[PDB]
Amino acid sequence: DPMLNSFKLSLQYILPKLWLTRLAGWGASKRAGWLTKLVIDLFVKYYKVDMKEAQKPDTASYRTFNEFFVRPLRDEVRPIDTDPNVLVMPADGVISQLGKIEEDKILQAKGHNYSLEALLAGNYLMADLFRNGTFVTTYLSPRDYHRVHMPCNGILREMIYVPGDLFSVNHLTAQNVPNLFARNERVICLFDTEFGPMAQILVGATIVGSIETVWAGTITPPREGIIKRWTWPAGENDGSVALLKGQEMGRFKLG
Amino acid sequence: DPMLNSFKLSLQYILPKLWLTRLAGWGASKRAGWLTKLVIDLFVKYYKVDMKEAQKPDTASYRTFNEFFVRPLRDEVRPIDTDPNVLVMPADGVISQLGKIEEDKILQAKGHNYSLEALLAGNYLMADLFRNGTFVTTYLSPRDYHRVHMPCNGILREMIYVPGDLFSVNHLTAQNVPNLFARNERVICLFDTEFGPMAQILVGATIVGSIETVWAGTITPPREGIIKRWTWPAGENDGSVALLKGQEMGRFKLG
Amino acid sequence: XTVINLFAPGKVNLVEQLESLSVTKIGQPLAVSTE
Amino acid sequence: XTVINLFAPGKVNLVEQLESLSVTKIGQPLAVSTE
């Protein structure tokens, strides 16, 4: 078991994670006939997907695997908490870790921390806003719905794309690969909100390596290897970009 | 023959550049007696390494290949320029490009630019010190001396380690790989000097991927996959780190 | 996959019921203002 | 490998003789301060 797993993790270290991702995304972009339906159906059976929650519950009505993978949910099935003083969950999934940011240190697994500055690609200014703050980390399974929504009202201020690796973020590697989320390719979004500044960070993984936001479209791929920054005004301004509590902000996808 | 230079580029894309780097560094750090002397000697004639400038001209004086690679030069053969108004070259080799940072863009090759902010891992504050500044890019070939020295007196202020790829830096990849130097693994050095702020950036390559500074030792390996930032006081404060024009500040090594 | 949220030091209190591996459904509550 | 130097905007003039493919040797002149 402990050595079975150290083989499972050598597999993480040995199989070419980016190549497998470009292959998956290549085929998940293709409009193949019965083939994409076949792959969807097995995926659905294997992972026990719940198509009754899908807006379009028939696997035949998805033109590609990716379209299925990013399928819209039924508006009725995810009601948004209407109190203006509570913040809603941003994504379907399960909580990995959550709590207090112990002076720049965030918990990855018990016996594994990572720094706020590492997660934030070296940006001490942005790291300053959240030192001794709170964090929540959410893991979206392949079963789950793969779009992400706003936990409260927000004015978009800053977006940063960070190049990085494509380790799996199954929770085996969460307990042995140091700096998992500070190492994997990811996209950082900073909001002004009535609860202070707020960050929502979208971390890729092997296969599920493509990340988009509603204001930008697909951010990666292509994988250009460099860090990119975009900024937006303070709100109530020309060019300002805002979203309200529970609005779709981005999504995950194969490639 | 654009068949053969594209053949080489194809190899840049496919061969597992990091594993070859460790493998080469594992061998380069083995004290294997007659076998390391055999490699040094083959290396010396293939690349026409001039041993007469080395403190230790006898290839038998080197216990590992790495120790040969970082071999000290004879004190007599690199006279520093005495003029305190003149900045001197930091490294042996050939100039790749130099000139005027044209509003944050640095020239890499004909028809290839890269941004100050990409070169600096997104540090836009530090990128602001050098807009419309001046840049020099020096290639150290396998033949040259592989330590690098201060171009002038300076007080260390910041050092940034940036994870990155391990592309080969040569005059073919420079003309074809976009963002070569903002993608490859590198260590950023920021100094206070009588000429203002100055950066000396050491960027690795395939096989020659190990990077050390005189004040911290070997920075890579390990390759921990995250951005680390170190800071130092301004000068005549306890802890300040100072280095004279022509002093050794770091070096490149295999693996 | 993974979304990480970050909040300012004293501006937010999060549900006492929520721990690791707690199921997460988009609309439900995650934290409440300290005001 | 490769060493890259950045100098601040108006603070330094490059030796007018240097160009792409000029041999460099530690301690030879590279740039001289302005004014």
Residues 6+ apart with CB under 8 A from B23: none
Which residues on chain B are in Cβ contact (under 8 Å) with A183? 163, 225-226
Please tell me what DSSP assigns to residue A242: E
Question: Which tokens hold the place of B12?
Answer: 């840049």
D3 touches chain B (CB under 8 A): yes
D25 touches chain B (CB under 8 A): yes
Residues 6+ apart with CB under 8 A from B73: B53, B54, B55, B145, B147
Using CA of residue A26, residue A169, residue A146, residue C8, what is the dihedral sign? negative
In whole angstroms, what is the distance from residue A31 CA to residue A88 CA? 35
Are B and D neighbours with ≥3 CB pairs closer than 8 A?
Answer: yes
Q: Which chains touch B (3 or more CB pairs under 8 A)?
A: A, D
Phi/psi-derived region of residue C21, left when phi > 0, alpha when psi is between -120 and 50, beta in every other case: left
A214 within domain boundaries = yes
B163 within domain boundaries = yes
Which residues on chain A are in Cβ contact (under 8 Å) with B14? none
Are C and D neighbours with ≥3 CB pairs closer than 8 A?
Answer: no
Domain that holds residue B194: 2-75+86-253
Please tell me what DSSP assigns to residue B210: E
C4 touches chain A (CB under 8 A): yes
Give the residue from B222, D6, B227 showing the smallest Cα distance to A121. Answer: B227
Count of CB atoms situated within 10 Å of the CB of B23: 14
| B182:A226 CB<8 A | yes
A80 within domain boundaries = no
Strand extents, DSSP E, B112-247: 112-115, 134-139, 147-149, 154-162, 186-193, 196-203, 210-213, 217-220, 228-231, 241-243
A63 within domain boundaries = yes
| B78:D27 CB<8 A | yes
Q: How far are the Cα atoms of A13, A128, A181, B226 from residue A133, in angstroms, in the given order?
A: 33, 10, 18, 21
Expressed in Å, this structure's resolution amounts to 2.6
B81 within domain boundaries = no
Burial of A189 (0-12, 13-18, 19+ CB in 10 A): buried
B80 within domain boundaries = no
| Closest residue, chain D, to B87 (C-alpha) | D31
B128 within domain boundaries = yes
D26 touches chain B (CB under 8 A): yes
| Closest residue, chain B, to D27 (C-alpha) | B80
Question: Which tokens hold the place of B205?
Answer: 């390559």
| A90:C23 CB<8 A | no
Size of interface B-D (CB pairs under 8 A): 157
Q: Which chains touch A (3 or more CB pairs under 8 A)?
A: B, C
Specify the number of domains making up chain B: 1
Are the beta carbons of D13 and D35 closer than 8 angstroms?
Answer: no
C16 touches chain A (CB under 8 A): no
In whole angstroms, what is the distance from residue A74 CA to residue A160 CA? 31
For residue B221, whether the previous peptide bond is cis, meaning omega lies within 30 degrees of 0, is: yes
Number of residues written out for chain A: 255
Please tell me what DSSP assigns to residue A236: S
A122 within domain boundaries = yes
